[model samples]
Target: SNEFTYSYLFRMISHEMKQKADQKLEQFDITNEQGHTLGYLYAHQQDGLTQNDIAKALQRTGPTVSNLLRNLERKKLIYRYVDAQDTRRKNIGLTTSGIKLVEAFTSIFDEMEQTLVSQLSEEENEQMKANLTKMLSSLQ
Candidate 1:
């Protein structure tokens, strides 16, 4: 059987981006996970997704999302409430402070994204994004 070398390239890029993103977030007093959580909440404000939703979207475990919510709660970054429609589930939403944090990070995130794609031409960046999306869809 032939082995593929794409895994190495994928992992190297993933690791480098994560490390740089983490470093940038550190200045905002937030972990990369926390920033992601905020971004999710910001995007789906009205939806107020449950922990399970976050887990699936982020490909994380239920317990991990729960723990992240706990930390966010302690920081007054987010709040959890029982869903009226689904008694068995709880919805997570960000607080005002959390929105401010998310907005600040959103700008930083845009900058970081530009930095990452800086070496590529516009066409190349679009093609790369399309290819990555297709690859992810294939996995699903």
Candidate 2:
């Protein structure tokens, strides 16, 4: 009867979303973090994102990103090449499999978002967003 704190409910919903996603992503052997990274690349690979760029997006350390990239590279899901004009800069992008995988993940998220948002009216939706921004800022 007392489990209604903001953080508590937020984590419950967060876990539910991840639980559903994990079940679907399991079929592709994709971890949550890896799938998220791929999805980011799907959206912004054309910007020629660098390893540093991804690390920044994920807010992860350089070594962590490197390990993740090594695994994705080994799986043939991504490719990296140094730009001739910028020797110190390595550009990262998705391979065909990565593109397809990210697309599948995107569709799943879209479906999930639709289902979740269905419960809200436009007014409720706006209030939810504003409250969320306030709540998020409280932590950061």
Candidate 3:
């Protein structure tokens, strides 16, 4: 009857953790959205990805991702270039500043990950990932 408690508590804790992360990022003049975008781009090596590709990877709407990309561009943290093969489409990449920002945020991210996983056994962590991924796939 109370199995939902786990999911509920997870959401509450995750939200609070994200708030803390946002606060930490404030000093860098970056919001959580910008950090997330930068992190994603950095992970992808920032060669560039189209808006649609980013939306798919980020599980967000195309327009929403576009808005975030525009904000990042305005901040001079990212660069947008029209795709030569498809002038109508654009690709996004992190600037040097953006890469540095993401590198700075990596320490905070590591701390957050350690804190969140401290209580879970390695097997449990793996299981959690598998279960969550499976659940997400089922939903999709």
Candidate 4:
């Protein structure tokens, strides 16, 4: 009880979520990072994002995003092409399998959220969200 800390709680929750996500993603044969990238592309494919754009959105380094993109492309889950308007830029988009992967990944999150919310009263849930937002804002 005396050792209870906010950082510890946050770490534990993050670890648990990642563990669950990794386990579920095993069936799809992708890592959590790859799943996240696919999910991002799924939402913003119409925008025709470049590697730099994805790096910024994912808060990862350019090299990291490049590696992830290479892996995804190798798996035939996504394709990259030179931008028609910007000859210097390459746009990234997902394949149909990538879209399906994103849907599966999103459903996992939805199911987890539903399970968590079911354990709380409506008022408690709202209060928890408010508190979490305040905490998150404080960090930023």
CA lDDT of each prediction against the hidden true structure:
0.85, 0.89, 0.83, 0.90
TM-score of each: 0.58, 0.64, 0.56, 0.65
- Number of clashing pairs per prediction, in order: 0, 0, 0, 0
Which 10 consecutive positions of candidate 4 have the poorest summed lDDT? 23-32
Cα lDDT tens digits for candidate 3, 1-140: 56678568778878998898788877897666767878899998445587787888888898898889888899899997787778887778888898888887897878988987888999999998899899879879
Q: Candidate 1's residue-wise lDDT over 47-115, tens digit each?
A: 868788889988899899888888999999999888888888778899999998998777776887888
Instruction: Identify the superior model by TM-score, candidate 2 or candidate 3.
Output: 2
Q: For residues 1-140, could you state the per-residue lDDT of candidate 4 as single tens digits?
A: 65889999889989998899789877887877988899889989789898899999999999999999999999999998788888898899999888887888789999999998999999999999999999999999
Deviation from native of the Cα of residue 50 in model 2, angstroms: 3.0
lDDT of 4 at 103: 85
Candidate 1 weakest ten by summed lDDT: 1-10
True-vs-predicted CA distance for residue 16, candidate 4, Å? 6.0
Q: Best to worst by TM-score, what's the order?
A: 4, 2, 1, 3
Best by TM-score: 4
Two-way TM-score contest, 2 vs 4, winner: 4
Error of 1 at 63 (Å): 0.9
Candidate 3 clashing pairs? none
Task: Please say which candidate is ahead in lDDT: 2 or 4.
Answer: 4
Model 2 scores a C-alpha lDDT of 0.89
